[PDB]
Design an enzyme around this catalytic site. Sequence first.
Site, PDB file in Angstrom:
ATOM      1  N   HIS A  11      -5.268   5.894   4.582  1.00 49.43           N
ATOM      2  CA  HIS A  11      -6.629   5.491   4.918  1.00 49.43           C
ATOM      3  C   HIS A  11      -6.661   4.606   6.165  1.00 49.43           C
ATOM      4  O   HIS A  11      -6.948   3.410   6.083  1.00 49.43           O
ATOM      5  CB  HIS A  11      -7.254   4.746   3.752  1.00 49.43           C
ATOM      6  N   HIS A  63     -13.319  -0.576   1.764  1.00 43.86           N
ATOM      7  CA  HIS A  63     -14.360  -0.995   0.832  1.00 43.86           C
ATOM      8  C   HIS A  63     -13.728  -1.075  -0.549  1.00 43.86           C
ATOM      9  O   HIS A  63     -14.413  -1.391  -1.526  1.00 43.86           O
ATOM     10  CB  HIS A  63     -15.509   0.005   0.816  1.00 43.86           C
TER      11      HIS A  63
END
EC number: 3.1.-.-
Lengths: 369, 366
Positions: free
Chosen positions: A193, A111
């Site tokens: 991530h 995101h």
Amino acid sequence: SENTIRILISSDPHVGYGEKDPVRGNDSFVSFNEILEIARERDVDMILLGGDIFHDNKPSRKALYQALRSLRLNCLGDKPCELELLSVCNINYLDPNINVAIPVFSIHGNHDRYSALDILQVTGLVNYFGRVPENDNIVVSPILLQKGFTKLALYGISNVRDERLYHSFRENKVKFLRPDLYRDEWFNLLTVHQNHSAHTPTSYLPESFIQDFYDFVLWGHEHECLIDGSYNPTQKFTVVQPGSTIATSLSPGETAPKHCGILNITGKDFHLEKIRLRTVRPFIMKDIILSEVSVENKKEVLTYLISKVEEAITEANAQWYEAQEKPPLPLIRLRVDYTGGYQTENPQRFSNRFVGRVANATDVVQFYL
Amino acid sequence: GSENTIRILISSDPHVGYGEKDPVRGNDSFVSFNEILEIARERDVDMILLGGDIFHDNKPSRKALYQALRSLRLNCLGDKPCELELLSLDPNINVAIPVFSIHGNYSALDILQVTGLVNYFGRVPENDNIVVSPILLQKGFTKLALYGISNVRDERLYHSFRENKVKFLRPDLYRDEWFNLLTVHQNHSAHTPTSYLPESFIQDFYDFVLWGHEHECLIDGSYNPTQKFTVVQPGSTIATSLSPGETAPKHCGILNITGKDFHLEKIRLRTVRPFIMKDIILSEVSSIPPMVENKKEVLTYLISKVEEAITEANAQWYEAQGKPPLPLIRLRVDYTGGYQTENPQRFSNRFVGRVANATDVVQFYL
Ligand SMILES: [Mn+2]
Ligand SMILES: [Mn+2]
Ligand SMILES: [Mn+2]
Ligand SMILES: [Mn+2]
């Protein structure tokens, strides 16, 4: 205390998740705030984050404001000027209690100009690191920090599509620029991530693909709190997946009670202390089996499940008191298997039965076979 | 070094965002607003004060918002602690330079304030009634009572004054040690006596009144003998229109206040693009023969004045610095008396890549 670097570590705040919602519409802001609030209360030297900071790709002006607000209120500290306000813009002097700046450091998630990172980062509140420009050929340059005699090398990889990442490692296109000044005297932190486990081997990042020279690995992406970590004895590092700060779906992984952590790094040894997050809304999930329970059946199922939801509610109230007047509306999910000829009902219909009693106004149950 | 002087960089109407999407002028607003802050830092002032109209657009773009904060951090934020040495409080530390502003006409502005880079003040709860609570500052023995009135429609402010509905809360301790500074953002002059704010309506206890909203630079200020204060209308930092007031070379000022005494140093902006304007009456000209096929002649005279204005523009850019950007050139041509003219845009396109406003090069009137 003079050569110990204190890093508050968390991940995945998802700032702006459910903004519009009339119950949960603030959770995001509150908990991302609790995160940074703890850091100042516990007096850490810096904050490390695992990415996925904003939820929306173009965040609302409300979201942007709220992150900024909480970032200032807690991480900016005192601002220096020879100008006193009589009625801040506050004179610092050089007092024993002087409010220092706590810099925040993060990589990007899935995101994640301009650009959410740009406004945070340009105000000097958030520092972004580990960003990758080419996916085919990655060159990770670390941040070097010195506190006392302790030296910390901070390496980052911003979210790469796991398959692409899988090949870049396999074909040697991920180099780590290590420093030669005091070589072998640094503590090496990796902040990633990616998925930690996957159904498909190429859709995650194997712990083995991460070089043995690292001592600590912070694991973003994955929302489930696993703050205590694990030691890989083949690569000789310690992996901490802090989890998110908000439950971004009603999955079993989001039910594990959220924490953050203070990583006390001194020299090359470290100590990690877990800290329960109070501001997170309780989430209890129960899996019910039709066969386990003991066809023209409506009353038997309905009463049992309705009394089983009222069971979870009081169990969720218990843990908000434990995590910490009235507790907030809990999140409740039931997974039930109606195999074996049991009479069911409409999913939302059952969830309109608990309005004002649970915060997930729509999917309190799912019926599977 | 002493120090008992409050030094304040005064400026107004930066209009961050104006003309954002123009190929040529697109970046003017951002840079000129950055210069303002860059100077403040080069000159080691204690604070910045703006008259308002900070952002040109209501909801400024994510770009407009980005630049303003970039400029604020780079020049105004100052050094931060942090007890941790990045390897990539001495005596040469950079201190924070607080920016204070009133409003012009979850806002982007709330973002400016929440980050801690700007302090909005002089807010008005009600248009009909205004109460002004002062920010009280102090540096040594010098005491500054800073008052604001964010923009109010000139008609309501006029009346709110005449009807004694504007109240100033003066601090009672050290009553007369306070140097009283007022920031307003209204019309200073108007053709009907209710659409501007008369200096007379401003109470005499003030000493310095900063006047935003008038874009024309009159930074030399003005003394008001009857009210006994000095009024300084610094002007904007970009030409937001092609008017006569926008032609006067743009400036900002550092304002040094010691005790109840002040002194205003003035500073020419470097980053502001030149703007020359010529008012022309064709009957006041030969060689332009009245009432005959003069179009060919009119054109050469006009094209020459433009060229002439461009050179004056380039020269004015050098006077400011101490290659220039494409200049803003306006010709206001009075064609009365039987003179043949051209399409205004055709004429303005004869200077593409030569002036910064190709679409408008001239205005014809009677
Ligand atoms: Mn993610
Ligand atoms: Mn996430
Ligand atoms: Mn204006
Ligand atoms: Mn205005």
